[PDB]
């Protein structure tokens, strides 16, 4: 079967930089798709805007920011919890401190994986694992 | 692509059953298959002995228990370093303690992944790490 992309939804160019590279440096296989607000993360979660007739199909996971500019992470994480036809992909919130954390857990939306940036392989992996995802080693 | 057989090589019968257990519970997609001597995992990787004409191909990694009967763990590695044919295959080593590793590197066989029993998954990905193999995220 064919990989599904990673969506990584991010605004902070730095931030972005880091992440990207980080999931290149522990030899992840998934393609990465870049949104950079909430807007974009949308459009490509609908396959509308930009991103209309793209490749069908829905991401492994969403690696989602939690501040974006015009529609907000949480906007975002509330959109694709909240819908039919979303609800399933699993989404990993990344944040800035361990206190965002604890807000976005008191909203009561259901997720169980965080990462606190910058990503590195160890929290991101056991966030995978919160999310029950399953993985694959590969011989390529 | 097919997804590649994980060689599980493990003669204590507690050992075998905890480590399917964590691969299992990590969600790794790959099928493990058991050997419980360095003579069962010689067979296999050379596919002849019981394995003979069995669905080919090299396993996606050797996860090896350094202390087995009839041939050890440590001939197991030697003949899968010096050989042309299965130098290729990853192996990560299991022990029983951190002190057993430092004997294994002493014998400069180029081994970089180790991991101490029970196997769980955050040393488990990071011996994948460490062997520079690329996993995936699936969707199912
Ligand atoms: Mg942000
Ligand atoms: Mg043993």
């Known amino acids: 079967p064919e990989l599904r992309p990673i969506l990584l939804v991010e605004d902070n160019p730095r931030d972005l930089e880091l992440t990207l590279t980080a999931l290149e440096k522990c030899q992840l296989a998934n393609e990465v798709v870049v949104a950079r607000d909430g807007t974009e993360?949308?459009?490509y979660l609908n396959v509308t805007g930009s991103y209309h007739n793209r490749p069908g199909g829905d991401p492994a996971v969403?690696?989602?920011?939690?501040?974006?500019?015009?529609?907000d992470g949480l906007e975002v994480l509330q959109t694709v919890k909240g819908s039919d036809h979303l609800r399933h992909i699993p989404v990993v919130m990344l944040t800035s401190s361990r206190e965002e954390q604890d807000l976005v857990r008191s909203y009561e939306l259901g997720v169980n994986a965080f990462v606190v940036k910058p990503v590195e392989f160890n929290q991101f992996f056991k966030a995978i694992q919160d999310l029950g995802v399953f993985w694959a080693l590969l011989n390529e």
Do not use: G
């Open 41 to 43: 993360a949308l459009d």
């Open 62 to 71: 969403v690696l989602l920011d939690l501040k974006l500019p015009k529609v």
